[PDB]
Amino acid sequence: KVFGRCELAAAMKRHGLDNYRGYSLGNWVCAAKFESNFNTQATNRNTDGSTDYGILQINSRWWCNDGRTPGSRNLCNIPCSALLSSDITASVNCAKKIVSDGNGMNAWVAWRNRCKGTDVQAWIRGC
Numbered sequence: 529k530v531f532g533r534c535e536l537a538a539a540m541k542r543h544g545l546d547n548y549r550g551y552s553l554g555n556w557v558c559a560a561k562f563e564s565n566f567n568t569q570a571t572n573r574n575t576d577g578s579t580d581y582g583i584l585q586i587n588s589r590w591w592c593n594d595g596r597t598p599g600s601r602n603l604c605n606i607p608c609s610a611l612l613s614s615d616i617t618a619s620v621n622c623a624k625k626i627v628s629d630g631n632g633m634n635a636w637v638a639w640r641n642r643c644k645g646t647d648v649q650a651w652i653r654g655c
């Protein structure tokens with residue numbers, strides 16, 4: 529599915545992301561916009577043989593297991609296929625582990641480059 533902006537904001541808030549580990553809700557909404565264009569089925573292959581999966585483009589080298597990525601660590605203990613559900617639960621649960629690992633939201637390249645330093649609360653304004 530393709531979420532609307534406020535639709536995703538509300539779902540992410542229900543799933544506990546607002547202010548999680550220091551990151552206000554707008555950060556997460558902006559990240560999803562630029563990572564997946566709000567599409568729960570987005571996938572992108574990388575040079576290292578990994579793939580990024582779902583609404584938050586979770587990577588198959590470190591975080592989820594897709595069975596085809598060399599050096600897999602599966603630190604979220606989740607099959608990547610679950611991260612292509614239209615229900616965001618598994619992606620949120622893994623994102624919480626990622627953002628707790630010690631480098632904040634820097635794991636998300638699109639957030640680092642296109643969200644960080646901007647007024648991210650604009651992404652939840654009007655909702």
Ligand SMILES: [Cl-]
Nearest residue numbers: 647649650651
């Ligand atoms: Cl604005």
